[PDB]
Structure formats: C-alpha cells, structure tokens
Design a protein around this nucleic acid. Structure first.
Lengths: 51, 102, 228, 120, 137, 150
RNA sequence: CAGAGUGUAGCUUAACACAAAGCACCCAACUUACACUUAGGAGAUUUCAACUUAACUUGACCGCUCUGACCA
C-alpha cells in the first residue's frame, strides 16, 4: 500500500519548518513534497535543452 | 549555529498532551495490523510458489530445473513511483532551463 | 508422454497509478506528524522574511511582502485543475478499461469456450517440447486479439497450479485432465485495441474476482494475488 | 558474623550477600523476588496473583513496578527481612521503573545495603 | 590420551554449517537469562551446586496438611476477566496509570493475598527458617 | 584437562564467524530509492530494512547517496531570459542486500512496489561486478588476516 | 459429497494451582538505518453438556486439514 510507510515526520532534533506543497510534473501529475515556503503548488517546466 | 533563527517554545496544554499520548497508542495497533497483513501476504506467496515447484518437478524435472535458475534480465529492475494525480493528456509546461549543482 | 496436459497460464497485473486514499485513522496521525514537525523546527527564510517585514512596518525596502507573495501562489494553484483520481469508467462500471480504479491493482480475465460453455479463466496456452514453461506464458500475449502491450515477467518459477479433471465425458487414458501453471507479470505500458473489448477480456480487482472465476478455480488464484 | 560468599570478581553478579532483591519483568508481568544466597526464596511479589492484578490497570507499566515494591516491602517487614542487596544492570538502574521500585522499598522500611560482616 | 564424554556437550546442538543464518543474542540480558536456565539443570560434570548446594533426599516431603479447597477454575476466570475490563473501561484509570500517579491500597491487596496464595507463601517462608525440618523432621 | 572427558567444554571460537552469484541465488543487490522528499526516502529505506530482517534476508549495508541540487528556471513572462523559480534537491537512499533466492525475487519485488510511496522511484540493480569494496578494518580483524598469510 | 484425521493469540510436551504462562510480535523515543536500551500496546483455550478439577478425559456441536466424489 502507498500509505504503508508514507506517514512520517522529520526525525531530527534541528531542522527548518516545511509545508505541504504539490509538485506538478511535466505531464500534469502531482506528488506531495515538503517545501521551505508555504507555496500552494510547484510546477516543473520543460527544459529547452532536451528539445 | 546562530541562535537568532530559533523560535520561542510554547508550552503544550494538558489536553493537547492527552490527545497526543492516546493517538500514539492507537498508532501502535494500526501499524501492527498493517504488518500482520503484510506478514500473511508474503506467507501466501511463499507457500504457493514452493508447492507449485513440487508439482512441476514430478511432471517434468527439466522444466523444474529451469524455473529455479536466476534471471539476468531481471536486473537492473526499475519501478516508477506513483503520483497523487494522473498525468494530463494535454498539458504544455512552460519553457525553462535546468542547471545542476554538485 | 503423460496423461495430464500442460498449459502455460499467465497472470498479468496492472500496478496502481495513484496512491490509495488515507484511512480516517491515518488522517489523525498525518495531522499530528505535521504538527509535531512545526513545533520542533527552526525559522525558515520565509518565516524570517515575514517577521522582519512586520517590524519594519511597525517602526514605519522590500517591494513584495511575504504575505502578499503567498496570495499570488494560491491564485495559480486554484487556476490549475488537478487530474481526476476517479475516472468516468468507475461511474460506467466498464471493467475493460485500464483507466478505472487507479488506486487498486487489476487482474486480466479472458472468456474462453470449453465444452460448448463459456468459462472465464486466465490467458493460457498449451506447452510444447523444446520450450520453457515461462516461455509458454509469454506466447499467450502474442496470441491475444489485437494487443500492443509490454509485460515485465518477474522470475521463471510458477506462482501457482490448478488441477481439474474432465466431467467423465472426455476422460481417457491418454487424456485424463490438465495442470495449468500460473506466471505473474507486470503490465508496463500499452492496451488492447478497440475492436473487441466487452466479450473478449475484462479487468477486475481481487474483491470482484469471484464473479467470473469458479469457486474451486478461485481458491488457487487468491493465493498468489495480493490486495496491497 | 555469618560469612558471605566472597569472590566471583570476574563474573556478574556478586555473591557476597545474605539476601538479594531480584526483579524479573517479562513481556506481560513484573515480578520481584527476595532470595537467600543459597537460592531459597524468602518472599515473593508478582503481578500474576489475582490479589495484585485486581487493582492494576496494566501489569507491565511503571505503576505495576512501583506497586510491587510497596507490597513486597510490607511482606518483608512481616517476614522480618530488613536488609537486602540489589544488583541491577546499568540500563535497569537508569530506568524510571526501577527507581520507583527502589523508592518503595526504602519508604517501606527495607534497606538496600547489608551491614558489613564482623570479622573480629 | 583422550576420554569420551560421559554425556552430551553443552553446545553440541548448535549447527556450525549455517553460522551466518543463526539468530544472535544481540544483548546481555538475553544471554544472561539463557545462562541461568542452564545453571539450574543437573550436569554430569562437577558443579558449584554439588559442593555448596544443600543436599536433599530423593523422597519428596510428605504432606500432613488439610486437603486443598475445591474451586471451579472456569467460573473464576470469567469473573476475573470481567472485572479487569471494567477497570480498564474507566478513562481516569488509564490517565492515572499513564501519568504514573496511580497506586493500589495495601490493605485490600493483603486481604485477597491471605486467602488465595498466602498459605502457599507461608509454607515456603516457614521452610526457610527450618520449622518443618525441626518440628516435623 | 585434555585427558578428562570434559575436555573442550570451554571452547568458544568455533561459535564465532572467522561475492559470487550462483545460478540459484542472486549475489549482491542494491535498492535505490530516489525521491525529491528526503523524509520519504529515509522512511522507505527503514521500511525495507526492517522488512528484510524479518524475512531472514541479509542486509550488507544501509547508506545514502550525495544530494543532487537542481536549479529550476522558468521563462519570464513575454520575454527570453530565464528567471529562478524554485530549487529541487534529489535525495537517494541505498539498501544493500545479499543472499536472495531467485524464486523469492518475484515475491519480494511485488511487496515493495505495492508499498512504494508516491514520488519515490524504486530501482534495484545487480552491482556485484562493480566490486570496489574498500572498507576500513579494525585491529583484531586485521591481525587474524596476517596470521593466515604468515 | 461423504471418508477418516485434527483443536490454546505466531510457536511451545506452558499451565500442579496460588494461575490462562514464556517467547516471538507492533508503536514512540535513541540510532543514517539496523541492533541495543527506555517508555507503551494488542492479544488466545471451537461451542455446549457429562458425578467435578476438566485448556487436558468421555461425547457431539463447530472450523481446519487430508483422499476420492464433484470437475472446462
């Protein structure tokens, strides 16, 4: 199951605060990642080099 | 190492500590069920695979001698990670440049 | 030879595309893990940016405020529409399209006719001399009706066996019964053509697997097929 | 004036005592034993008996360990045992469950150190 | 010159072939518990118990007491389990136990102790003082 | 004593321990867990590490890969110059396992891939040919090696 | 479908009674992780009777397992 071991926290004594953000990929798919800023979403553009 | 970036530590209320302690005990049982289901799921595949090999050996030992052999083409093995949303059939990402720092 | 026929069965499975939704108990722990992470963390660049701006305004050269910049981020997220985790096929209950039930795995079932009767079984082909048992399961994909799929076979050992005998009609000394060997594989990419979908094949989960399979045949399949 | 079994310097635990407090805590239960050096058990206190189990919410927590010492100390006074040695491991000694058990024995009137033998 | 052992060796059962796939103790407490179990078993070689242990006769000591009371175990267990469930049902007992502030009444525990296992502890305690040895040989 | 029947009772050295991939068992496997989130890669590596232990599967080593930072540039609105938009960090965890049966390979792969979290890529590769197993040694381990050579 | 066989949570030749025990197992903390340790959690006698102690013996009642019937 995808939720078998997905629920975890930062197991460190010192670290920066993170916020749940959505990483929109180049195909529209999104994955939940933690970012320094409370941005509502993140979009990955397509590189001109691989064109 | 700078102490200016440290945040003030607010004391936790008694009820907030009460909820967290009981939630960590309920997390001890939910995770035990996940492991129990995984433990039996592995057992089901292992017993079925071994019993099938026993049945295959009697029918034809030549096929039995090939089934247990390793598969070089299996490795390297890659599995793509799931996504929270399915890919968009018609999506044009903006133009950009990627630079890597090591 | 032997009085038992050899058939190379195939168990093709489609890995889930999306993560399974969290249980209500998982939601309680997920909020706590984020809450504990906040209370035991240091100030970030954006948190320090917001604090500095407030003091500067209270006493009174940043054009963009930290809170104002957050609003612009939220506007873009609302304009973008996320993909639908629940597809139209779930509402249509069309068990032939791979797009349905992205959270759960799908097992291929094909309808075959034996003894003037249609029986739902896994795809299979008869074994031939000078060919591995796994190769027979691979040959089943080619025999499929208008299929363009790439499958990843995991290992060469069979994952199960089912034995049945003819109901005393076709029973003979040379032909007494059959022994099918199941091979599991992962469906990487591709799908069948649009020529024949309904009557040819269906894709069902393990929970709804008993509708098509026979109770004796269902017992052997539920052993090597997980529901994780 | 009774001699103690001196020696056993290369092994653990020591044998130079008349009575010893030995605490056995399993997965589900916690038991404390007061036994002579020869191996005979003088008095015992465990969570398996219904007398203690009927008042314990859990037999494997710190409260169960603390409650054993209070009952054991009461039984030691009735039996006449006031001095006994305790030989814990470094991790057991640092544990909070053993510190409260020792506190119960001391508050119960039992001394966790025997007097030195009189040689002359 | 060599002499064959008079009995089984201590570590004879351990398989030396698959030494890598054998579970290890990994802790001092696990070895200590297993070590004490083997120390309480008789051995064909000389042991500390042979010279310092108290010699006992093979004939088990005869019992001259009253016949034991007759109790229905099945009925006893049903009531005992039910009482614990009600004790655990209270949300205050769980919080008191979790906060490490709970305590038991000493008078009540001894009342049930004297009825169930009090006589058994007294027999063991009286044996330590040698009352059975002197009064009843 | 040697002449006594209890000779060798104190022996303990035979109870203490002093790669090639056969056609039936895989020799060396490296499980690569690459994801943009460091928490999920470390958590899944721990999840796999505990899974292998209960399955009597030897884990050679659990380590981490160097972080790869990628700057994300986006084209400016109605322009040609790339403006810094975000920073993405690649975190990878590797768990090394050895002694896996060929038949068990299908079983193990199916369980982990189902448990694979979103955004975490799963890669298992045979790297036994790479070798380069240069590890620092302690004195007692080193001393016995010389005695065999001498 | 009958035919026999079989019975404590995962295991056990734990269970005399004072009593359903020991181990394994799950979380949190510590550890890159594992392990160790600490602090916590979930637990069992198939169900009814038999002069009664009966988890144990005598019977069925219940499920499981095994061989054929059944079978594409």
């Amino acid at each position: 199951d995808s939720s078998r071991a997905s629920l975890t926290r930062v197991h460190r004594q010192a670290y920066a605060r993170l916020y749940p953000v959505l990483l929109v990929k180049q195909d529209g798919s999104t994955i939940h990642i933690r970012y320094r800023e409370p941005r509502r979403m993140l979009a990955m553009p397509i590189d001109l080099d691989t064109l | 190492l700078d102490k200016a970036r440290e945040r003030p530590q607010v004391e936790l209320t008694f009820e907030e500590t009460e909820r967290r302690a009981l939630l960590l005990k309920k997390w001890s049982l939910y995770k035990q069920q996940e492991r129990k289901m995984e433990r039996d799921t592995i057992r089901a595949m292992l017993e079925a695979q071994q019993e099938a090999l026993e049945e295959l050996q009697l029918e034809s030992p030549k096929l039995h001698a090939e089934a247990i052999k390793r598969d070089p083409n299996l490795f390297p093995f890659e599995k793509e990670g799931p996504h929270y949303t399915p890919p968009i059939p018609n999506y044009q990402p903006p133009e950009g440049r990627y630079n890597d720092i090591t | 030879g032997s009085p038992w026929r050899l058939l190379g069965a195939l168990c093709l499975q489609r890995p889930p595309v999306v993560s399974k939704p969290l249980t209500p108990l998982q939601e309680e722990m997920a909020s706590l893990l984020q809450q504990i992470e906040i209370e035991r963390s240091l100030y970030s660049d954006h948190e320090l940016r917001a604090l500095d701006e407030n003091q500067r305004l209270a006493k009174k050269q940043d054009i963009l405020l930290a809170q104002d910049l957050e609003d612009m981020w939220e506007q873009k997220f609302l304009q973008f529409k996320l993909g639908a985790r629940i597809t139209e096929a779930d509402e249509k209950n069309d068990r032939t399209s791979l797009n349905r039930k992205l959270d759960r795995n799908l097992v291929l079932l094909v309808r075959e006719k034996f003894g003037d009767q249609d029986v739902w079984i896994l795809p299979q082909a008869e074994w031939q001399p000078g060919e591995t048992l796994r190769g027979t399961a691979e040959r089943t994909l080619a025999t499929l009706s208008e299929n363009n799929m790439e499958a990843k076979f995991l290992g060469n050992a069979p994952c199960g066996h089912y034995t049945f005998k003819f109901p005393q009609a076709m029973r003979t000394e040379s032909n007494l019964g059959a022994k099918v060997f199941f091979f599991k594989a992962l469906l990487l990419t591709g799908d069948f053509s649009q020529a024949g979908n309904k009557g040819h094949h269906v894709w069902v989960t393990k929970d709804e697997l008993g509708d098509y399979l026979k109770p004796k045949y269902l017992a052997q399949v539920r052993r090597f097929v997980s529901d994780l | 004036v009774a001699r103690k079994e001196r020696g056993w310097r290369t092994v653990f635990p020591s044998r130079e005592f008349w009575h010893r407090l030995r605490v056995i805590r399993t997965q589900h239960h916690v038991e404390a034993l007061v036994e002579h050096q020869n191996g005979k058990v003088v008095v015992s206190a465990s969570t398996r008996e219904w007398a203690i189990k009927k008042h314990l919410y859990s037999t494997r927590n710190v409260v169960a360990c603390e409650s054993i010492g209070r009952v054991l100390a009461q039984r030691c006074l009735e039996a006449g045992i006031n001095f006994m040695v305790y030989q814990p491991t470094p991790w057991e000694a640092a544990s909070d469950s053993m510190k409260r058990l020792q506190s119960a024995m001391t508050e119960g009137g039992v001394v966790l150190r025997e007097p030195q033998r009189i040689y002359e | 010159r060599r002499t064959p052992p008079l009995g089984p060796m201590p570590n004879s059962d351990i398989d030396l072939s698959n030494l890598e796939r054998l579970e290890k103790y990994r802790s001092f407490d696990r070895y200590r518990r297993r070590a004490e179990q083997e120390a309480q078993a008789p051995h064909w070689w000389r042991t500390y118990r042979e010279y310092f242990g108290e010699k006992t006769d093979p004939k088990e000591k005869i019992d001259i007491g009253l016949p034991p009371p007759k109790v229905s175990r099945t009925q006893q267990l049903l009531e005992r389990k039910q009482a614990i469930q009600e004790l655990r049902a209270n949300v205050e007992e769980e919080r008191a136990a979790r906060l490490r502030t709970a305590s038991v009444p000493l008078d009540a525990v001894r009342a049930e102790w004297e009825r169930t296992c009090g006589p058994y502890h007294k027999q063991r305690l009286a044996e330590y003082y040698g009352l059975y040895r002197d009064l009843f040989h | 004593y040697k002449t006594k029947p209890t000779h060798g009772i104190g022996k303990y050295k035979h109870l203490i321990k002093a790669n090639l991939g056969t056609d039936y068992e895989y020799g060396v496997l490296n499980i690569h867990l690459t994801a943009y989130d460091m928490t999920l890669a470390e958590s899944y590596a721990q999840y796999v590490h505990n899974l292998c232990n209960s399955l009597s599967i030897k884990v050679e080593e659990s380590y981490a890969m160097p972080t790869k930072t990628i700057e994300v540039l986006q084209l400016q609105d109605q322009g040609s110059k790339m403006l810094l938009d975000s920073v993405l960090t690649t975190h990878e965890r590797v768990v090394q396992i050895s002694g896996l049966s060929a038949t068990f390979a299908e079983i193990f792969l199916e369980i982990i891939q189902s448990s694979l979290p979103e955004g975490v890529r799963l890669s298992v590769k045979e790297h036994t040919e790479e070798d380069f197993k240069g590890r620092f040694k302690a004195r007692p381990e080193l001393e016995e090696l010389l005695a065999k050579l001498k």
